């Protein structure tokens, strides 16, 4: 995030980090329950990638983080790589996440929900802070 | 790339207003936000754009794409969860 700020540790419990086997953070995601995380289809997550939960500082070795394995990747059948439309992919975890004060689920809207233009919402992540 | 989790609040825009920056690339299952002095950037993809509805943070969009230099002056583009939630329900319900 460019021009963002540091979050309070553990305040966005659903935020997970998708890392490859190298340990490299390549995409973020959100826990929707103990067995499912939602991310972008264009991240290209495979089953050899890992989902890290309860993490705040990627440089800390003293955080009680959860390294969860992916059982199966579910790419939205409507996903269009040419237009990047319907960019959503579900991850079924082989290992179930254990919810705690720092690990829990974000809510999903109903198909009917409307969020008016002008509404101030929030986005989180470990993406570049400046290009 | 930051070691510690970042956050930023930003306004949601209408697709028609967003089409002024992005044109025809803005599809219906997309929702823009930003052009407010902050901007999602590379490595944030897949992450949440949450809005507080009735006391709880609800997943409104998923970081997808936007400006190649993460210009804080142009809106980022997120997958619109309302247009996708039915597929999520179906997928969870069958596995």
């Amino acid at each position: 995030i460019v021009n963002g700020e540091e979050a309070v540790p553990g305040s966005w419990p659903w935020q997970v980090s998708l890392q490859d086997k190298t340990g490299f953070h390549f995409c973020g995601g959100s826990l929707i329950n103990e067995n499912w995380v939602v991310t972008a289809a264009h991240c290209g997550v495979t089953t050899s990638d890992v989902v890290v939960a309860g993490e705040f500082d990627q440089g800390s070795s003293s955080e009680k983080i959860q390294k969860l394995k992916i059982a199966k990747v579910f790419k939205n059948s409507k996903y269009n790589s040419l237009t990047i439309n319907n960019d959503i992919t579900l991850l079924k975890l082989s290992t179930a996440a254990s919810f705690s004060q720092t690990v829990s689920a974000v809510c999903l809207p109903s198909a009917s929900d409307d969020f008016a233009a002008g509404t101030t919402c929030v986005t989180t992540g470990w993406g570049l802070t400046r290009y | 790339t930051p070691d510690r989790l970042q956050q930023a609040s930003l306004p949601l825009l209408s697709n028609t207003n967003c089409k002024k920056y992005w044109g025809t690339k803005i599809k219906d299952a997309m929702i823009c936000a930003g052009a407010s002095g902050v901007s999602s950037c590379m490595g944030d993809s897949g992450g949440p754009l949450v809005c507080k509805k009735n006391g709880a943070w609800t997943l409104v969009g998923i970081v997808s794409w936007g400006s190649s230099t993460c210009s804080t002056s142009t809106p980022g583009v997120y997958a619109r969860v309302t247009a996708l939630v039915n597929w999520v329900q179906q997928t969870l319900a069958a596995n």
Binding site: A7, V8, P9, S11, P13, S100, A105 | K52, G55, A56
Partner: peptide, 10 residues
């Protein structure tokens, strides 16, 4: 869902 045990500070 959607209500952190450690509330966000914006």
């Amino acid at each position: 869902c959607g209500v952190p045990a450690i509330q966000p500070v914006l």
